[PDB]
Amino acid sequence: MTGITNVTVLGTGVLGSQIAFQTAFHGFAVTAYDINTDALDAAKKRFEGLAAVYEKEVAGAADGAAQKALGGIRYSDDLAQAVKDADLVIEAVPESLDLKRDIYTKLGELAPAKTIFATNSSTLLPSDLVGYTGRGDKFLALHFANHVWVNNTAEVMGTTKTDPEVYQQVVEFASAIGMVPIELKKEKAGYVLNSLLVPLLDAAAELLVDGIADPETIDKTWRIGTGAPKGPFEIFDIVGLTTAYNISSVSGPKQREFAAYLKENYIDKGKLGLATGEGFYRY
């Protein structure tokens, strides 16, 4: 008769907690899973943080609505119990092939037949994981963006093996929790958004490193030329220069030249971007 009602999220970190909370906020029955009681205690702290954020930032969260969502969440550190009646499992464990491999094999065994599996992985492709799951027709990617309550896209990307009626029901779940479903047709590293954004940021980095123009110039050129609200380097500051450095340092020669540039001129000086109050720009 009915579809997705019970959702279990694996991991209560930065994205796990946001995913779980947004889902609870939209009336699903949520279980947050993590490794031990200390991780669960820390999860609860995040959920209380999110609740506060929602009551100030999110439509409909005022006057106790965010607290009620908070209070309704269940915590579990026993995977078997955590997914026992799960309609959907959203996996946001650390970005580690080994650690996700471990997770899915167990999850494939412990979760009832009905359960749809969805990974939030940034870099690990579903195909890289579909094996360990044991239910490829029910395994796909549901990829969120940090600050899901306002950057509310959910990229839906399955494998060739993925069942279309499952894919569609994930899409509809995404709408149910207030996301804009971004539907990919074939698997793709970086889904859509990162696929578009990285090339822009790389081109900007090259201009800076090769001494063609300063950040301000590059940024105003982009805002004026495309009408965008923020230029590449303003975007770097939002992404965070530590993240930008990590990514830059594992790519072609030119990017690595940028990573070294970030390290010397920003990272080493403690100018990590927006969150810390100064990166390419002072805030």
Ligand X SMILES: NC(=O)c1ccc[n+]([C@@H]2O[C@H](COP(=O)([O-])OP(=O)(O)OC[C@H]3O[C@@H](n4cnc5c(N)ncnc54)[C@H](O)[C@@H]3O)[C@@H](O)[C@H]2O)c1
Q: Which residue has the tokens 């694996």?
A: 10
CA angle, 217 as apex, 214 and 222 as ends, to 5°? 125
Per-residue x/- track, 99-138, its own copies (CB under 8 A): ----------------------------------------
Instruction: Confirm whether 155 is a catalytic residue.
Output: yes
Q: What would the two tokens of residue 183 be? A: 């539907």
Contact set for ligand X, span 24-83 (CB under 6 A): 34-35, 39
Sign of CA dihedral 173, 235, 283, 263: positive
Instruction: Confirm whether 122 is a catalytic residue.
Output: yes
Beta-bridge partner residues of 90: 9, 118
The catalytic position among 6, 17, 91, 155 is: 155
DSSP type of residue 231: -
Contact 147, 239 (CB under 8 A): no
Instruction: Confirm whether 194 is a catalytic residue.
Output: yes
Q: How far is the CB of 16 from ligand X (least distance, A)?
A: 5
Q: What would the two tokens of residue 229 be? A: 């609200």
Q: How far is the CB of 202 from its own copies (least distance, A)?
A: 7
Q: How far is the CB of 143 from ligand X (least distance, A)?
A: 6
CA 107, CA 37: separation in Å to the nearest integer? 20
Tell me the window of 47-55, 93-101, 220-228, 259-267 that interacts with its own copies (CB under 8 A).
220-228
Is 15 marked within a binding site?
yes
| 136 binds ligand X, rule: CB under 6 A | no
Q: How far is the CB of 223 from its own copies (least distance, A)?
A: 10
Contact set for ligand X, span 151-180 (CB under 6 A): none
Residue from 73, 86, 93, 156 binding ligand X (CB under 6 A): 93
CA 152, CA 181: separation in Å to the nearest integer? 9
The catalytic position among 26, 48, 55, 122 is: 122
Contact 14, 93 (CB under 8 A): no
Which residues in the chain belong to E strands, given as ranges? 6-10, 29-33, 74-76, 88-91, 116-119, 139-144, 153-158, 180-183
Beta-bridge partner residues of 117: 89, 139
Q: Which spans of this chain sit near its own copies (rule: CB under 8 A)?
A: 145, 151-153, 155, 180, 182-186, 188, 192-193, 195-200, 202-204, 206-207, 210-214, 217-218, 220-222, 224-230, 232, 235
Q: Which residues are catalytic?
A: 122, 143, 155, 194
Q: Which spans of this chain sit near ligand X (rule: CB under 6 A)?
A: 10-16, 34-35, 39, 92-95, 99, 103, 120-123, 143-144, 146
